[PDB]
Amino acid sequence: VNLEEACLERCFPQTQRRFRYALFYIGFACLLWSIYFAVHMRSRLIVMVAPALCFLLVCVGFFLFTFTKLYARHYAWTSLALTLLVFALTLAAQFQVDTCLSQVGSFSMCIEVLFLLYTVMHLPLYLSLCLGVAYSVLFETFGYHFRDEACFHWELLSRGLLHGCIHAIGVHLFVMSQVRSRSTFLKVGQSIMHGKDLEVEKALKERMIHSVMPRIIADDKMQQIEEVSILFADIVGFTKMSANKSAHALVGLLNDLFGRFDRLCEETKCEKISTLGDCYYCVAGCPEPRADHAYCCIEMGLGMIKAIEQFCQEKKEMVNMRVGVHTGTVLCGILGMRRFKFDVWSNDVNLANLMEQLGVAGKVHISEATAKYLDDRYEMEDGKVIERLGQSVVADQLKGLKTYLISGQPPINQFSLNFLDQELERSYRTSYQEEVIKNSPVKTFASPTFSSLLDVFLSTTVFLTLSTTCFLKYEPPPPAALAVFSAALLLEVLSLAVSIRMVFFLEDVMACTKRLLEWIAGWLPRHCIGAILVSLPALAVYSHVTSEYEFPVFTGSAALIAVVHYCNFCQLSSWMRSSLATVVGAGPLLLLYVLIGQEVVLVFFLLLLLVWFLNREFEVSYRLHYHGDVEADLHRTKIQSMRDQADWLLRNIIPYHVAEQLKVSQTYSKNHDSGGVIFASIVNFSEFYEKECYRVLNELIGDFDELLSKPDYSSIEKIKTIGATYMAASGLNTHPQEHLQILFEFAKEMMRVVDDFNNNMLWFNFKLRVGFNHGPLTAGVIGTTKLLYDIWGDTVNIASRMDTTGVECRIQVSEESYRVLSKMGYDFDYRGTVNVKGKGQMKTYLY
């Protein structure tokens, strides 16, 4: 009931203006009648024109009531108060009747007041219908009882059918007027709610975009920006933190730790690329060409050491940082269509990663290139990596590069009734045509197809009842009367059958009649049939007139309703209906007469003005209703696009099995008893690389991304891509090791397209080493304002070890995975032993 109040207060300006215009019209009707009463009814003046002028003063008082704040609270009461007064005046004016007035004048007083109460007063259905019928029945009762004999069965039935028509038109007019207003208010409410939901989801999509891309990239496909300082950090001691701590608690610690990193990164105003497990590597100087990149990178790197001690002293941990800095040229951009993220690729990045591996815990490690951009603002210490770690495999490729360490510091025109935007107006014309075309179901009472059904039905019952009274008078009728009525009846039943078939769409329909049914729904053909349909009651009356006219009171009284019937078919243009009513529903009677003559001209002018005005008001109600519909549809198609974009970019960050949980809790955590991770890197790209070469790399990843869309790889969800390496995981959503089999086929299919893609290259084939290991892994979502899904653990780090110790297009596998891979029947070869941290020399078999 609160929304009904909300409907009423929003629609109140319409009701207030509608009531005010009724006040103007009734006073105008009272004034014009008084002038006519003053000239042709001079026999009794003070008893006839004084109520007219007194009621005119009442309208001014009622107009004064409108501005009052009390009227806004009880506008229904004021309309009810006027209704009784206008009822009393018309019945009193009918009470009296060169001293006699024709009834057609009184009938207009009954008709015009009835239309005002039903349509332009916004009173309830039960009150308006009961008051209208009670006023009508008392109008007829007073007329029959108080008739004059000095001047002037089936006759009584004719009066009821005539009054039956106006009430039928009146309730039809008011119900649809109510239906459009309620529908327009609702669709406006949905539109304003859709718009509010659009802003909250447009920001959500931007937040999803910012989770994989920086702000500057999001403004709008690769770059060759040089002089870029690359950070690298490692959580030395995560393996200790890995054991004897719960998964949710574990991801909580890193969420605060990386969140602390994210905050200080914002303080450093640098860019964070991604967090590879415990590693946190971030770039400076790209894509924005910042010149202080080295000094910021040193600052956050030392800040990370400062942050970890604060982090250690808060939740009581024992961990440190191994920071590595190397500046130089770098490549930036996006690879892939799914799980695509901003990343940096160069030999500098690997050396920057290598520098982090050559660092010492709690110390920032820098390159010689970085030292060139560093002044004495910090302390310089010799790197001393050669004697710290000996001549190890990691230290072989330093290639004589000296290194250093750092410790700290309403569009409708009033006249023509058209939409101001011509494109909207054109769509409005074809709306009924396309509504039939799409076969849209009848949703509400304001549907254009349903609206036509009742308009045709109302034109039916009005035409028969109006014609019934005319035939009751004759009970020889002229042949023109029978022929017109039969043709009108023949047209009416076919038009009614068209309306029901346009709504109900019976199974007897075929394509042939559908084409013409759509054809009829067009603007011009509907006006061609509609104008005749509207005029059908009008020609019914004028079919019964002959040369023996000199009969006149009945035809005039019946013609009062034929012009009244013209308010029906609201879908048709109001100007055509209003003009046709003047020319074909009122015109034929006016020149037929050519004081009774002066009275009829005044009577029809008042009715035509009311008919013209009501057609004006209900047309803009219909036009504004369609405006509300198209805006709601326009907002619904804009909310679905944002729905698709936000969901797709959510899939760009987290897989399916994570979206539901993030809808329940702000943090995600899960441990895995058995989990396989795939690492696939490209070697000969460096030989191919010399930005122009990386475009070929992008389509290669896009070809790899097409492997994920295959129905047989729905259990595999990639994690991310770093450099030329592709990281995929199988078993997160979980034969006990069926995920591994799909993962192995993914790696095999991975080189299959690699060899297939090499066929399109000129004298250059690509390379792909794949590592494989399965076991316990922990995953989770990192960040609050920037989401990030990644998996880390012993199996992940050992998986990357297998790519580093990799060979040509050959799937390196661990002993643990070989325990279950060779059982099924996979043909596997042996290679030997490689260096593995945490397990010593590892027995590595191969595909």
Side-chain angles (χ1 to χ4, degrees), residues 1-19 21-146 148 150-201 203-205 207-220 222-239 241-268 270-303 305 307-317 319-336 338-371 373-401 403-501 503-583 585-594 596-669 671-742 744-841 843-847:
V1 86
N2 73 349
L3 83 161
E4 215 81 1
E5 182 36 79
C7 174
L8 271 183
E9 52 76 20
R10 263 307 311 149
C11 155
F12 169 78
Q14 203 189 44
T15 73
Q16 162 187 226
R17 164 201 81 81
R18 273 182 177 174
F19 179 74
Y21 264 122
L23 301 183
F24 144 76
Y25 162 70
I26 297 183
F28 186 77
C30 284
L31 183 49
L32 269 206
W33 269 119
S34 77
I35 310 323
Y36 162 83
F37 280 147
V39 55
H40 296 122
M41 274 296 132
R42 250 170 298 112
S43 152
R44 54 191 161 251
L45 182 85
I46 43 151
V47 304
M48 180 94 67
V49 317
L53 59 97
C54 280
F55 214 91
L56 200 144
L57 254 286
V58 160
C59 293
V60 192
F62 259 115
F63 216 73
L64 188 105
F65 220 128
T66 306
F67 320 125
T68 71
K69 212 182 47 57
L70 185 153
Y71 163 74
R73 283 192 202 197
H74 330 109
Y75 45 86
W77 266 95
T78 80
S79 305
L80 196 165
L82 183 70
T83 312
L84 320 180
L85 279 141
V86 187
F87 282 173
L89 175 69
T90 44
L91 300 162
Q94 199 282 131
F95 148 79
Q96 272 98 301
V97 282
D98 288 333
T99 69
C100 301
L101 180 64
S102 170
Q103 193 302 339
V104 184
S106 270
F107 197 22
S108 37
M109 305 190 336
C110 160
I111 288 178
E112 271 81 314
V113 174
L114 270 169
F115 257 53
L116 291 153
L117 158 73
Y118 276 111
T119 70
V120 79
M121 301 215 168
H122 283 278
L123 291 209
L125 194 69
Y126 57 95
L127 217 32
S128 276
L129 176 51
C130 95
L131 290 198
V133 169
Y135 164 71
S136 96
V137 86
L138 192 142
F139 197 80
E140 175 210 279
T141 291
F142 271 10
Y144 159 105
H145 281 68
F146 294 26
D148 56 335
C151 288
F152 288 115
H153 209 177
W154 296 122
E155 191 46 10
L156 261 297
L157 191 41
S158 161
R159 274 311 210 211
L161 301 159
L162 290 203
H163 276 222
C165 288
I166 181 169
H167 298 315
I169 304 176
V171 62
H172 165 269
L173 263 197
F174 149 92
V175 153
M176 248 55 88
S177 186
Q178 282 321 1
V179 161
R180 304 201 211 300
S181 35
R182 305 269 174 280
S183 207
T184 310
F185 164 70
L186 254 186
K187 298 201 103 40
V188 152
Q190 325 197 347
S191 156
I192 208 74
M193 150 288 277
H194 277 348
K196 275 210 306 298
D197 174 44
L198 174 88
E199 191 36 60
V200 81
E201 262 185 10
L204 159 72
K205 152 192 140 173
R207 179 180 108 111
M208 282 332 91
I209 283 291
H210 286 358
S211 266
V212 291
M213 276 167 23
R215 301 191 35 283
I216 317 86
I217 297 320
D219 82 327
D220 55 85
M222 311 265 278
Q223 269 104 328
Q224 196 83 342
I225 165 68
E226 306 227 351
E227 281 151 337
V228 160
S229 272
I230 297 139
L231 250 195
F232 256 95
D234 214 27
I235 298 325
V236 277
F238 198 9
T239 74
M241 290 332 122
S242 86
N244 312 359
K245 304 163 141 283
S246 301
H248 200 136
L250 191 36
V251 309
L253 293 184
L254 329 168
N255 268 262
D256 298 38
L257 181 51
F258 295 139
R260 183 147 305 100
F261 290 152
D262 290 338
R263 178 221 84 233
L264 66 86
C265 179
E266 296 150 8
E267 306 289 335
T268 320
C270 270
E271 144 158 14
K272 166 204 137 191
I273 304 289
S274 76
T275 83
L276 314 152
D278 69 343
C279 166
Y280 184 99
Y281 87 100
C282 34
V283 305
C286 55
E288 50 253 77
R290 193 201 218 98
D292 202 73
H293 40 278
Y295 284 122
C296 314
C297 265
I298 296 296
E299 184 270 341
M300 38 190 327
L302 300 168
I305 318 164
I308 204 59
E309 311 276 20
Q310 162 178 3
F311 186 69
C312 282
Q313 83 199 63
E314 280 163 325
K315 208 56 77 177
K316 291 332 193 326
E317 303 106 306
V319 75
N320 213 350
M321 215 74 61
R322 207 186 348 135
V323 200
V325 188
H326 169 20
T327 192
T329 188
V330 86
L331 283 87
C332 316
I334 303 312
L335 301 63
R338 55 223 44 198
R339 208 68 41 103
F340 59 92
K341 279 193 199 255
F342 193 110
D343 208 319
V344 285
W345 332 298
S346 291
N347 41 274
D348 289 349
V349 166
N350 308 118
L351 184 44
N353 202 335
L354 193 154
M355 201 85 48
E356 159 268 357
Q357 270 145 11
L358 291 187
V360 52
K363 287 289 280 312
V364 165
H365 211 186
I366 81 148
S367 206
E368 184 225 36
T370 288
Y373 302 93
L374 293 184
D375 204 3
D376 211 353
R377 291 197 34 237
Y378 311 82
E379 77 278 346
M380 325 331 300
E381 325 274 359
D382 192 21
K384 304 184 163 228
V385 189
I386 302 169
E387 98 294 19
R388 180 179 307 111
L389 306 168
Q391 272 189 7
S392 77
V393 196
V394 186
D396 289 347
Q397 53 272 66
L398 57 72
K399 303 168 203 179
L401 170 163
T403 168
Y404 303 83
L405 295 157
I406 299 188
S407 40
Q409 274 260 29
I412 290 286
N413 38 357
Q414 310 207 15
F415 221 83
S416 79
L417 254 53
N418 272 8
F419 286 111
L420 293 180
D421 169 320
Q422 197 271 323
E423 158 212 9
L424 195 47
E425 176 24 40
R426 178 198 78 263
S427 52
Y428 168 57
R429 294 241 169 81
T430 72
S431 305
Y432 202 14
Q433 182 141 224
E434 59 205 64
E435 213 278 337
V436 173
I437 290 161
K438 329 332 211 298
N439 208 315
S440 307
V442 173
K443 278 158 201 172
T444 74
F445 228 79
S447 160
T449 321
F450 197 16
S451 183
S452 312
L453 171 53
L454 299 160
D455 295 0
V456 167
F457 156 101
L458 178 60
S459 148
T460 308
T461 173
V462 165
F463 155 67
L464 327 164
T465 52
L466 175 131
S467 299
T468 318
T469 71
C470 292
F471 274 114
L472 278 193
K473 154 42 179 186
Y474 282 162
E475 251 277 349
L482 281 193
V484 152
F485 158 76
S486 279
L489 198 43
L490 181 131
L491 186 85
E492 192 55 68
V493 297
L494 285 279
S495 34
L496 185 58
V498 161
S499 296
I500 66 170
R501 282 236 181 87
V503 163
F504 294 109
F505 269 129
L506 286 170
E507 75 275 351
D508 297 326
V509 83
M510 69 294 294
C512 311
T513 192
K514 274 222 191 193
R515 211 266 299 167
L516 70 96
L517 190 77
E518 297 179 341
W519 165 49
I520 292 327
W523 192 250
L524 198 34
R526 218 182 46 243
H527 285 355
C528 171
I529 184 62
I532 281 300
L533 272 183
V534 179
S535 187
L536 224 51
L539 331 177
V541 157
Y542 302 139
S543 59
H544 293 277
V545 300
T546 42
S547 75
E548 63 161 68
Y549 206 84
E550 286 176 302
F551 267 110
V553 58
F554 183 14
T555 289
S557 157
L560 253 53
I561 290 175
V563 66
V564 156
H565 163 254
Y566 264 70
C567 288
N568 176 248
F569 299 80
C570 198
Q571 58 189 152
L572 270 42
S573 97
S574 89
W575 251 96
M576 172 210 67
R577 290 199 320 275
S578 288
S579 275
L580 247 193
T582 319
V583 170
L589 201 74
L590 292 190
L591 85 185
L592 172 134
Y593 278 32
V594 187
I596 311 111
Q598 247 307 300
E599 156 173 16
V600 170
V601 179
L602 172 60
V603 156
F604 271 92
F605 164 69
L606 255 54
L607 196 45
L608 274 166
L609 158 73
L610 176 65
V611 160
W612 270 71
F613 198 168
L614 289 205
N615 288 6
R616 251 280 310 251
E617 292 197 69
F618 291 143
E619 180 90 60
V620 313
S621 162
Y622 181 98
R623 289 177 111 80
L624 258 53
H625 164 55
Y626 191 66
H627 193 357
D629 206 329
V630 303
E631 294 323 288
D633 203 3
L634 196 164
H635 277 206
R636 162 205 104 74
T637 189
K638 284 182 41 43
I639 208 74
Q640 209 50 45
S641 74
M642 271 311 187
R643 209 54 61 70
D644 297 347
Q645 289 209 19
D647 292 6
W648 184 71
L649 296 162
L650 200 67
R651 222 70 36 77
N652 187 33
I653 303 153
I654 51 190
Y656 168 30
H657 59 272
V658 177
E660 322 97 312
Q661 270 106 315
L662 245 181
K663 272 185 292 297
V664 187
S665 43
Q666 208 41 244
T667 65
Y668 187 102
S669 188
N671 94 341
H672 304 100
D673 230 336
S674 188
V677 50
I678 308 145
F679 265 67
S681 176
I682 294 176
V683 200
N684 75 331
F685 193 33
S686 91
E687 321 199 18
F688 187 56
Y689 167 67
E690 256 206 353
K691 184 189 139 137
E692 82 273 59
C693 322
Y694 278 63
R695 318 162 290 172
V696 168
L697 194 82
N698 193 357
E699 30 172 60
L700 188 42
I701 302 314
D703 187 12
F704 293 154
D705 273 15
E706 211 269 348
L707 258 58
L708 288 168
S709 46
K710 312 265 206 73
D712 53 323
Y713 295 128
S714 94
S715 155
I716 283 163
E717 272 302 312
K718 86 178 259 198
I719 303 311
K720 68 159 73 72
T721 172
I722 37 181
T725 316
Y726 188 83
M727 180 173 179
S730 80
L732 326 167
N733 46 66
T734 53
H735 200 260
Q737 285 278 2
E738 196 182 349
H739 64 98
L740 206 143
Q741 330 171 6
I742 314 181
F744 209 91
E745 298 268 30
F746 196 97
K748 287 183 55 65
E749 204 91 3
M750 182 96 98
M751 337 167 194
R752 256 194 278 274
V753 284
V754 157
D755 215 3
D756 166 51
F757 178 84
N758 293 336
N759 286 33
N760 314 55
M761 207 40 81
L762 296 190
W763 276 259
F764 210 105
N765 42 52
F766 271 158
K767 185 73 151 273
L768 190 89
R769 314 161 301 191
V770 176
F772 214 82
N773 170 326
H774 93 268
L777 78 85
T778 180
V781 166
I782 302 288
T784 47
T785 200
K786 303 172 74 81
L787 294 190
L788 176 33
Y789 185 77
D790 166 293
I791 81 166
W792 50 88
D794 204 7
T795 181
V796 168
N797 274 313
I798 210 176
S800 195
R801 197 43 177 143
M802 296 208 162
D803 282 19
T804 322
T805 62
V807 277
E808 157 77 276
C809 263
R810 268 332 297 271
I811 308 186
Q812 290 233 14
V813 72
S814 84
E815 218 271 353
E816 279 74 45
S817 288
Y818 178 94
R819 290 260 189 80
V820 80
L821 255 166
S822 178
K823 280 185 329 177
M824 91 165 58
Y826 259 105
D827 38 357
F828 267 26
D829 315 281
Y830 188 55
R831 191 180 107 123
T833 40
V834 314
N835 302 3
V836 154
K837 184 51 71 193
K839 285 179 195 327
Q841 297 308 75
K843 323 292 301 312
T844 81
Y845 292 78
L846 208 169
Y847 182 32

